[PDB]
Design a protein around this ligand. Structure first.
Ligand SMILES: CCCCCCCCCCCCCCCC(=O)O
Length: 133
């Protein structure tokens, strides 16, 4: 039941994204631009394939996956990872693994907003997205 996550979403709040990016070794200049960028995230399904686009003035990504099936991914910061996305407690949980490290990207719906929690190391970033009509 991924249905309430589908659609077009725009970033409206960000907490601790610089901490998260620093933890991943992202360079200062990229952090700097990223801290002023407001992406649009588009989540689409076709049968049990989901496609998740992240669009911005800086970087752009797109992944397609089946829930519960591992896929290769190259992240916006150029990490080559092994990924899996699953529903867990009604949350869309994306786990990335590379070099023995793990990142998680957890999405949930609260009061119609999509809350993305990004964790690497001890860093925890919370980004809030709201629907675009
Ligand atoms: C879409 C522009 C983001 C720019 C950040 C690039 C360097 C850090 C990337 C970290 C992993 C992906 C973070 C996604 C954040 C989000 O979807 O809001």
């Amino acid at each position: 039941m991924v249905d309430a996550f589908l659609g077009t979403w725009k970033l409206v709040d960000s907490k601790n994204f610089d901490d998260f990016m620093k933890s991943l070794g992202v360079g200062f200049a990229t952090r700097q631009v990223a801290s002023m960028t407001k992406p649009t995230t588009i989540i689409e399904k076709n049968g049990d394939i989901l496609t998740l686009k992240t669009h911005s003035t800086f970087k752009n990504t797109e992944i397609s996956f089946k829930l519960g099936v591992e896929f290769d991914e190259t992240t916006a910061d150029d990490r080559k990872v092994k990924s899996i996305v699953t529903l867990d407690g009604g949350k869309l949980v994306h786990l990335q693994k590379w070099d023995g490290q793990e990142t998680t990207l957890v999405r949930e719906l609260i009061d119609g907003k999509l809350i993305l929690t990004l964790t690497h190391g001890t860093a925890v970033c919370t980004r809030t997205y709201e629907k675009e009509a």
